Amino acid sequence: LWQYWRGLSGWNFYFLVKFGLLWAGYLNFHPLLNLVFAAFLLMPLPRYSLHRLRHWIALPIGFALFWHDTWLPGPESIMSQGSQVAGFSTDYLIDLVTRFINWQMIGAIFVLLVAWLFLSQWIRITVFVVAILLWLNVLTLA
Amino acid sequence: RGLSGWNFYFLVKFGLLWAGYLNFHPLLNLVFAAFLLMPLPRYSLHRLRHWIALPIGFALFWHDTWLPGPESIMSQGSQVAGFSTDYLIDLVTRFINWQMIGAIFVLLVAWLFLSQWIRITVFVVAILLWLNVLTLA
Amino acid sequence: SSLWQYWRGLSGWNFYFLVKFGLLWAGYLNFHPLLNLVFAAFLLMPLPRYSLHRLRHWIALPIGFALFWHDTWLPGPESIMSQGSQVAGFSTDYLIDLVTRFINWQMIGAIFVLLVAWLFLSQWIRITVFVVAILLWLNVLTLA
Amino acid sequence: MGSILTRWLLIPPVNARLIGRYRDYRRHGASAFSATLGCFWMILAWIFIPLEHPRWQRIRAEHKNLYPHINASRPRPLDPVRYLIQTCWLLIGASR
């Protein structure tokens, strides 16, 4: 089964971003759910097809989980209030978007991406991600 | 050949014990563990043991849980047959702590990963022995 | 195809950052640590294709300039355009005098010395490691 | 560290690999203490460093050239520090 354990690949970056956001105070982090998700991603699958399937399944799940961890209104609230947003002029929407998007945060995420690309070659980032996840869970239980 | 898949069984029990969901009977579980560790030379005896152990393990786990005895369910089961499918689903969702399920899953993955490096049986037996000592002290 | 053959040091941009650090130290620059880091990250990003590298340099030049201008207290291009019509009325002699007053020959000489130092040191040491370390350090100081 | 303890704690393939290596270190004149520590560090390196990656393969292949002062077959307790220092040197003033 040793040969079938494949590190969190691109999902390492997903978690790093989450950690960064948690640290910045933008995320309500649910430690156990994220650990379960990580466990799901680390689970040893022998077949290449199962790996593809996992990636496909993991993408929506990861997104959902990320959203859940965010302070963002549920898709239901957006759908019910979305009809009010459709009446906003394009200029207002752009203004809202520019105010909402912190270009500094985007830049940080980018820097993190480059760092991750660079570090993933030297160090097993998965080990750290899992360690931090374990640690965060322990903190929530203590 | 070590406690193979039964290591996970005990780990789950330990986890539940720690969470307060299980009344752990240390002696019965030790005996069960001893039964599982007994060296059998033949591959067939190993299969038999697994078959026997499955009902015993389940019985023991149930016994260790706060769940109503099969007798109580059978006697009250006729009252549950009248419940609408929606109520049953609601009851089931309320009863199942999705967090616990997730924890068990995580434990499983951890166990699969660690079992490749370390003999988990040694730890399980050590904890069992320790828990028995605590109950006698 | 290990993305690795494609990691190239900050080459000439090392000098750009050194100059910035020197100016920051002299108190002439309001250094925005995160933006400069992002820029550095952009420059370090691994690109497999030679064409993408050329493109990066082309893009990086205006960005680097813009960022350098931003980090300086210099009036925004808008202020210059709106007040520029007032500067067009200045006699060539005045403009030269203003320029001579504005340009500190000592600072130009320092930049030149820094350039020579960099060319010389770059032969022995990887300056990129230092530039990135200082950038990271400056960012940490702003967060502490 | 043929110690009954490793036989009890580690699975047979892992134990066999560790013992093989340990013995290899002993054959090349490493003290028991140094050999154990070497095995420990290796394990740590495997855990944190993707030794399967083409980069680490190249570095391992050129180990004798890059780290002439460190004998891979005779580990010394301060070998990690030596690796760090040398690596720092290679990273900084080492261009020719």
Curated annotation (Swiss-Prot), chain A:
This is Cellulose biosynthesis protein BcsG. Cellulose production is abolished in E.coli K12 / MG1655 and W3110 due to a premature stop codon in bcsQ. The chain crosses the membrane at residues 21-41, 55-75, 100-120, 125-142. It is found in: Cell inner membrane. The chain holds residues 14 to 155 of 559 of the full protein. Disruption phenotype: When the bcsEFG operon is disrupted in a cellulose-synthesizing strain (a strain K12 / W3110 derivative called AR3110 with a restored, functional bcsQ gene), cellulose is no longer made. It comes from the Bacteria.
UniProtKB/Swiss-Prot annotation, chain D:
Disruption phenotype: When disrupted in a cellulose-synthesizing strain (a strain K12 / W3110 derivative called AR3110 with a restored, functional bcsQ gene), cellulose is no longer made and the rdar morphotype is lost. Induction: Part of the yhjR-bcsQABZC operon. Expressed at low levels in mid-log phase, expression increases as cells enter stationary phase, the increase in stationary phase is dependent on rpoS. Expression is higher at 28 than 37 degrees Celsius (at protein level). The chain crosses the membrane at residues 31-51. It is found in: Cell inner membrane. The genes bscA, bcsB, bcsZ and bcsC are constitutively transcribed but cellulose synthesis occurs only when DgcC, a putative transmembrane protein regulated by CsgD, is expressed. Cellulose production is abolished in E.coli K12 / MG1655 and W3110 due to a premature stop codon in bcsQ. There are two conserved domains in the globular part of the protein: the N-terminal domain (domain A) contains the conserved DXD motif and is possibly involved in catalysis and substrate binding. The C-terminal domain (domain B) contains the QXXRW motif and is present only in processive glycosyl transferases. It could be involved in the processivity function of the enzyme, possibly required for holding the growing glycan chain in the active site. Belongs to the glycosyltransferase 2 family. Catalytic subunit of cellulose synthase. It polymerizes uridine 5'-diphosphate glucose to cellulose, which is produced as an extracellular component for mechanical and chemical protection at the onset of the stationary phase, when the cells exhibit multicellular behavior (rdar morphotype). Coexpression of cellulose and thin aggregative fimbriae (curli fimbrae or fibers) leads to a hydrophobic network with tightly packed cells embedded in a highly inert matrix that confers cohesion, elasticity and tissue-like properties to colonies. This is Cellulose synthase catalytic subunit [UDP-forming]. It comes from Escherichia coli (strain K12).
